[PDB]
Amino acid sequence: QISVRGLAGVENVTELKKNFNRHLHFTLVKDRNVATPRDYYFALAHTVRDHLVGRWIRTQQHYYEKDPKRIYYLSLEFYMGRTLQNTMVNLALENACDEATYQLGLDMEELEEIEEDAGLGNGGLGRLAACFLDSMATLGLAAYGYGIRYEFGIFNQKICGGWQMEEADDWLRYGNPWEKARPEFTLPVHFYGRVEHTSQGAKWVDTQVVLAMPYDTPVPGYRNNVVNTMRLWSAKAPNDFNLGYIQAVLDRNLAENISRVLYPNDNFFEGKELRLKQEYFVVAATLQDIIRRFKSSTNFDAFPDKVAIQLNDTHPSLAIPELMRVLVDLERLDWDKAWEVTVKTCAYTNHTVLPEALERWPVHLLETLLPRHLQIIYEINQRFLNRVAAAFPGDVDRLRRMSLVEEGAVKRINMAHLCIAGSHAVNGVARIHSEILKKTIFKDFYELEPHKFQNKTNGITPRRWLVLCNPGLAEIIAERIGEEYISDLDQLRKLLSYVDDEAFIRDVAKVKQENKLKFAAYLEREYKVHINPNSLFDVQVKRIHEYKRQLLNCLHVITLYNRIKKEPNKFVVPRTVMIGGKAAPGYHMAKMIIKLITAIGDVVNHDPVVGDRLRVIFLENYRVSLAEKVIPAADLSEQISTAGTEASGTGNMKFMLNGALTIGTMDGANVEMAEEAGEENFFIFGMRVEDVDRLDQRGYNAQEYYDRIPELRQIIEQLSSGFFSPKQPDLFKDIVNMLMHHDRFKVFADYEEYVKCQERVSALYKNPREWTRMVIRNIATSGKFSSDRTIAQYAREIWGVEPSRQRLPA
Amino acid sequence: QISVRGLAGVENVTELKKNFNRHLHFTLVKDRNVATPRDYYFALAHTVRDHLVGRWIRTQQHYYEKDPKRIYYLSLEFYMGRTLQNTMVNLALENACDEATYQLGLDMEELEEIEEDAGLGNGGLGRLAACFLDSMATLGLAAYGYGIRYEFGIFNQKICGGWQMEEADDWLRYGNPWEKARPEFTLPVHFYGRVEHTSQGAKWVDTQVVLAMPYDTPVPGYRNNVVNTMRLWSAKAPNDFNLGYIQAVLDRNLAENISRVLYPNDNFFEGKELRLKQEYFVVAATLQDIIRRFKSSTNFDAFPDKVAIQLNDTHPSLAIPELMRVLVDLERLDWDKAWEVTVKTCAYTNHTVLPEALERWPVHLLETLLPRHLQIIYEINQRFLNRVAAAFPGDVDRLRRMSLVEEGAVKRINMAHLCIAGSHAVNGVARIHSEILKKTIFKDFYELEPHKFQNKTNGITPRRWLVLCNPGLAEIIAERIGEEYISDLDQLRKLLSYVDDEAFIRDVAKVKQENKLKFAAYLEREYKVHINPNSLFDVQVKRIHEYKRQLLNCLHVITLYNRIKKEPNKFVVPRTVMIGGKAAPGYHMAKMIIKLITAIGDVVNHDPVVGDRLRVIFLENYRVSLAEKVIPAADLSEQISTAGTEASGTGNMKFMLNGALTIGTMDGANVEMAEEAGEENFFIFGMRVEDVDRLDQRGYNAQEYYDRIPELRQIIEQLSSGFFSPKQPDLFKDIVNMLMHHDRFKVFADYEEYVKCQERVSALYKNPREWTRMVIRNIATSGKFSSDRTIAQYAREIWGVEPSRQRLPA
């Protein structure tokens, strides 16, 4: 139908149909009379999958022959989403499959909606890993994503009585056609035990063993015939395990629980033993695999030349002492040599500065679970501090501040300090975040080793976040500048010469309108809920957290409602405010915020006087697949975290690439986005990081804002009196109390400027032509935010490898 | 190579090779450079599997169109063994696959050894179900095997220090290419809850729900293009289950444990709650499936005309009250009508008379787990006893003897009584067993309803137990009488006219010698253990149990050893005594018997004076696949259970069909086997059932035999003094104490006649020609023991359906 979806050749379409019927028959064991839409989805998935295998096998054979430096991206999260459409896009099979299924009397879009999201992530951090895998494959890097194959990913969110309810994400229920179990490469992982010091070296003995079974999933590059691998480990109990008989067999569950479920926390550290087991499990199995592959290429001096390990935050930080353990205890290398290798091999990426998110494991936990690693960590700390003492003689406080071991109630190991000490590179994920790291939390480390600190601003893949979710926009763009931008997003700047092009302006606006109509329809289809497609789509989708300030958005919504009620017959730009996102199960305040949003909707959406001028909808079960639907339909992107809290943000980039304007604070990547597009094409408001610090030095007193702002006072009084919760008048007391007495994120401080800024947004929306022209200026300068650019920087500046856009023979 | 393995056509072999390479590439994602023997096995399994699907789909479509009466065989055990070779045999693809793999440079036999046994059974009972499925498909019956898909089947047995060690049978580790998950047909199963009595009818509410997910495995008939289904249920927790968050997800294990492991008991009842859950789980899911299928064909009067449910022992006995529950509580039929339907639909097969094997569930268990079913059982009992009271007025003891409810310490429900009351047919599995049922344990029931009692002598499938495991024998037989006997075993009688044929005599003996050489080689390959192929192969393989009397065999072995030591230079027919079988993990005496056997081997196998004249080997991990190897190599079959204890036995039939002579008691099917072949061609010895009863009335005193038999006394003294356990002199005290003071199976009573009979066996073995002629007389009359004959009788006399040997168009 459209050009960027490839050719629908005669032979290819015929071949696809035959293979589709072949799988339906031989693979699913069904015939057209009893086949269901799900059967058809699988028939198509297997058919598309077949096209991947050939490239997958030769890509891997290729790396074996050429033996390039391997990149290992370790993460406990890979937020992949669906795989069918992404695979067709990267293999240029979309139109062909669309035609083939059409001729078979099937609607491919309907079939795509059947696939379960691979939700092995919580949010930004896990999605980043997914975008990175796509970019690494597209840039021809010999990269491997290593993680855990959770039986249950992020929970499915149900809203009941306005409250969030969690239910198990049994994503493997119907099977996963994309993965390939590789039981032949199963590896043992050790836990507990004790350390024995013999004549030559220490030995970790009397351990409990859990097997790590790998499952491989193909990661196709964009039209370059490269197919990399994402290897996820699954926990398996050994067969002699616990070997009454029946109970012993049933207790195998204990060991296999390690890969059972993803911890649902976003930017929050929960020091549970099970989580520590998952972290070591992925690290231990992965490192053995890495070393095995290295040996089949004794000379560990060249290890750093053939291996790069990227730690996605501190979750896989045990890779440092585990690598030391293997080199020292098993390979028998001297400490200093092993340490040299480890440092040159490992690199660490920090994704947050919030104190509650930093991993600080109790020593008693490591002591019992990983006795040898604790000893290695102490030795690392001893040697590191000796270096600090030599560089800053007499500075005893620096010593205690930089120690990997924190003293106090219970001794803990600061995993971030461990990562900096054992990595040759440490990076932040946005310019402002990386600067904050050097000026605050990692200042001491930066002064000791300035060369280690870098910045690698985040990005998103333009394949999934443009071509796949917004084909209409990708098409009108391709019509003017070709398709080269899909793997070279910087080319979007050429669109600047069309900012005054009446035809283009009209097409950009038309695509957005179509996306909104499609989404407005979807809302009634799967959720029965009416909305006005002509209104401004104001959306804030991301995990629910106090720092992201969904509450500030709520205050604005209530302000709009109160203004309408005050002057009913006054004209106001119609808005549909959409807020979505999951709250961690144990995060009470976050759950209360969700309830508040639905409560506001209950009042606003049924007030006759408001009419279709204002609607407040809470988007249930926000996930990757839902993001692909709502982002292309958005007009306004809410990125309003308190300055200095959102390390980077990536949703912000997705909105910018898809034609939405941004209202936000100078936080994370928002700063660079505004810099790229020009501040006059961005809706910036609120305190800058410096203003927040000034307020903290002086002391934040929310009461002051409450006393000086009548509209704000009115909102708080409405919340307190039960205006939004008639049957339960004090339902939101916790929220009001927090806002008034212990709001770490200064919601009130940015309220006035936020509301004012929102007024300017509505003013511009009233002028369709100028709004669209500003949109074009944003889309045109979003090129820097492609993860291809991010990965190219990691490749050259950290891993020491050159990216390549060379096609492999298919 | 040989004729009964089909044709190796040019086009077919070429097609097989291509498809083999296709699966290796697309399905396993490997190429000839990294493929392992296991990869090749799977490539072949998928290739053969492809040939099944077409027939599987049309067979099922066929039953839908013609709508014949459906046969549902409910069993908690299906001891299937391997599936690859069996599938090739039934599809006439063996030679073609042999050639195709040959041309690909692969040894098919080597690949077949890679497949894991589907050990979802303990022994005879589970294997019978497997043979039955094969026969039902071969006879064109619309039959379905329904059971549980245990994650872990019968444990793998390891022998350490002469002791049995158990290890989990993780048979699904590498995947199962034969099954097809059918998540779309998942059904809910209820547990616990309580009963509510409303205006119209009772309601079972507040129940805990477990989902039953079916996995279908194809069951091919022998060359008739019929492919039936074996549907096994897997337990799955609902997603709202238990819905801290993490713990709730982990606790899903509780519900899914239902299908985790097979209880490893043979002829022994263990009243554990988990076992009861498994029993109801299979019954509840199966009945819903049955009714669903029936409705898609309101008129339950015709239910018995379209449905037959066969209960494999009492394990699935809850089908009776469950069917009543559904008809009365859900369909709203009046009791009497529902009962009429239930009785005409259900039939029960008893497999044992041992008291410790009978299922007697504590009322408190049913009360808590299945409250509605207990009420239904009480009502059934009330009405049944009213019938008994009317037929035998004033006979109050009969009432208490026949009650489904047993009074005493704890009230229990006699499931066997429940089955007889709710079934229109009750059968034993061998003529003598069925007679014992009418004369003893079920005498009262037989007097009340004589018409219900029948006999259906067991059988074994000649496909797996002849053509598959002994192609050499199948070939020489086919050479003389054709291939028709494979699905009409009675034709083997034609071999009687070859009993004097010198050529045939020579071939029969040659095949046996080849099988022995092959097995003798296997023993050194996988177990490193030397044996003499020229010796008489004396084997007893079956589950270890006191009633099977492996101990009597041990006494004979020790007797042989003592006789040799007494007169070293006297000639004796060389023997290799092989004993194998698993012991239930909690069956202490059985485990002690295994230790005794290995202990005897330790002494006998290393005594220089004995030389290669006597060897005692314990066959480790006896399973279906091992049975296929050792049975064709056997000369003497040990079937020595105490008269009246082995209901039928089936291993006995396998040995007879494969050219081994039988030494045994007049127990189970041994009686009919001797009757068929002629007593002069069988080695019968010991007490008959009547002799056992006489001994019991008089009182069994083992001391008497010990005092009158010097050789026996010597053996007991050797055991007691530590002759077979130097380091642990009293190691076998429990065994001696049991034999001397509480031997329920009168081992000593049959010792003298057994040893005497064994002497006649050795005498005949010394005359190769006459031994073989007797073998021919056995093989020639083994036709009655084909499970095709057994199933044909079940079909006509119980299910009311006619078997058919008509091919379906392929």
Ligand SMILES: O=C(O)C(=O)N[C@@H]1O[C@H](CO)[C@@H](O)[C@H](O)[C@H]1O
């Ligand atoms: O640490 C977390 O839980 C987490 O999701 N951190 C997230 O990582 C993303 C990728 O770098 C950043 O863009 C987000 O600003 C940060 O909060």
Ligand SMILES: O=C(O)C(=O)N[C@@H]1O[C@H](CO)[C@@H](O)[C@H](O)[C@H]1O
């Ligand atoms: O009940 C058991 O555990 C069991 O295996 N019973 C077995 O069933 C077989 C099939 O009918 C019979 O041939 C055996 O004699 C009987 O012990």
Ligand SMILES: *Cc1c(COP(=O)(O)O)cnc(C)c1O
């Ligand atoms: C991109 C994405 C995120 C991250 O969004 P931010 O607004 O940067 O926090 C979270 N969840 C999903 C499903 C995403 O697609």
Ligand SMILES: *Cc1c(COP(=O)(O)O)cnc(C)c1O
């Ligand atoms: C046939 C068979 C049995 C039953 O043997 P019996 O001697 O009748 O008890 C038990 N186990 C296996 C593996 C079998 O093949």
